[PDB]
Ligand binder design. Structure first.
Ligand SMILES: Nc1ncnc2c1ncn2[C@@H]1O[C@H](CSCC[C@H](N)C(=O)O)[C@@H](O)[C@H]1O
Ligand SMILES: Nc1ncnc2c1ncn2[C@@H]1O[C@H](CSCC[C@H](N)C(=O)O)[C@@H](O)[C@H]1O
Lengths: 251, 237
């Protein structure tokens, strides 16, 4: 069914149903990022912008609020429908710089090039390694000359750190430097009410892919982009910096 | 063209003017034999290199089809086989092949692969491996893998709490399960990156594609000291 996490295991045992184990995407009770959008803006606008897997407009609207023309591309027709509902209930000027398009960000093709192409950490992490290559290839084909590819990328503690070195003393028949660089983790969340009474006690688990920023960056280089900047920021305006803003251009 | 690490460039100028980078299988093979039993019927070792484990396996008396991709490496292996005595040599059948896609039309009691071999495939190819391996297992037959386990892979992931409102108050728990790291080397008076899967990540992948993983046994590769490897047992339901 849902993912049975270790903390959830204990809770659900302790609470005896009453408690219910759920994935974080079914029911139910269960988006604001103007600080992330702002991070994207800082790091650019000449022309129109393409947002990939724009979901429901979490960033797309903030972008439109800054006067930008946005082609928002989404795969889910249902999310697409919901986006178009929000879009319907907003000022015709706001409405008219926005273009929705169904599409697969791993293999998409528009009758249009673009000065700026943006993708949020949430989205890039939906793709495996193969599709990620598809994305890079695709994007390259949609950048006007000199245009930037801007990516936000969540940064785990392990990816934030300077990987631990281990020097050695191995003679031949030298000094050896090993590093274990992070490439990909699984972010696992568990959310439950602070009580235990409540009734019902719904326990929310989710597992998702979480790529190391440096990893994406290597992928990017390997695929013909140059990464001209990488900038840590906190997603909620202040706190620990838990995100990296990456700029890529075609050489 | 060769990978330019941080420690390289801080030695590349911190020297002036005066390249990429391209062990004993006894303990390791024994660990495989521990989780094998009988053995009735022959064994198939995928990506056998040049016999580092194969020769151990033969000394356990086993019958081994050793699959390897490389024409050059097969040349080495064949010569080594030729210097072995004849009962060793006659229990070893070499085959050029691709561990990610191969038919051999025969099935095997046991199927075996080494950490270095599986770490050489990306995700898609590993999907193919498990599919192949399946196609080549006799029922009840065991699929054994050894997997390097780094310090990241073995540690209990650190957990972060945090209280949040609505207006209902919630508790939020976040763990980071390791899955893939990069092994980066700098040899030194010389460079190499490489894949290093988390044994757990491989296990998840085995389940995702058919097998029930019946055992995960940590062992030292050297055959002494800290257990730096994991022997995984898989079978087809
Ligand atoms: N292959 C694909 N092609 C296009 N969109 C995809 C996709 N796979 C997943 N998605 C979409 O990517 C979104 C990920 S969540 C990101 C939403 C938004 N950019 C934000 O910042 O909140 C989801 O809306 C999902 O429908
Ligand atoms: N796809 C593949 N199929 C079979 N053997 C492979 C392979 N890729 C790499 N190898 C071999 O596995 C060994 C890695 S140890 C090397 O000997 C290498 O030549």
């Amino acid at each position: 069914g849902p993912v049975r996490t270790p903390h959830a295991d204990v809770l659900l045992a302790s609470v005896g149903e009453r408690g219910v184990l759920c994935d974080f995407y079914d029911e139910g009770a269960a988006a604001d990022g103007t600080s992330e959008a702002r991070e994207f803006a800082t790091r650019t606008v000449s022309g129109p912008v393409l947002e990939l897997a724009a979901g429901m407009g979490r960033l797309t609207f903030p972008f439109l609020d800054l006067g930008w023309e946005v082609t928002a591309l989404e795969l889910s027709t249902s999310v697409l429908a919901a986006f178009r509902k929000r879009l319907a209930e907003a000022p015709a000027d706001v409405r008219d710089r926005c273009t929705l398009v169904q599409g697969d960000m791993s293999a998409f093709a528009l009758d249009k090039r673009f000065g700026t192409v943006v993708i949020s950490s949430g989205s890039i992490n939906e793709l495996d390694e193969a599709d990620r290559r598809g994305l890079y290839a695709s994007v390259r084909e949609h950048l006007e000359p000199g245009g930037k590819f801007l990516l936000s990328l969540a940064m785990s503690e392990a990816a934030e750190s300077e990987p631990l070195e281990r020097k050695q003393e191995l003679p031949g028949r030298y000094v050896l430097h090993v590093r274990h660089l992070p490439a990909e983790e699984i972010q696992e969340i568990t959310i439950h009410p602070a009580d235990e009474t409540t009734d019902p006690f719904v326990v929310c688990t989710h597992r998702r892919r979480l790529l190391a920023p440096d990893q994406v960056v290597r992928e990017l280089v390997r695929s013909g982009f140059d990464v001209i900047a990488q900038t840590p920021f906190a997603s909620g305006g202040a706190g620990r910096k838990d995100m990296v803003l990456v700029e890529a251009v075609m050489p």
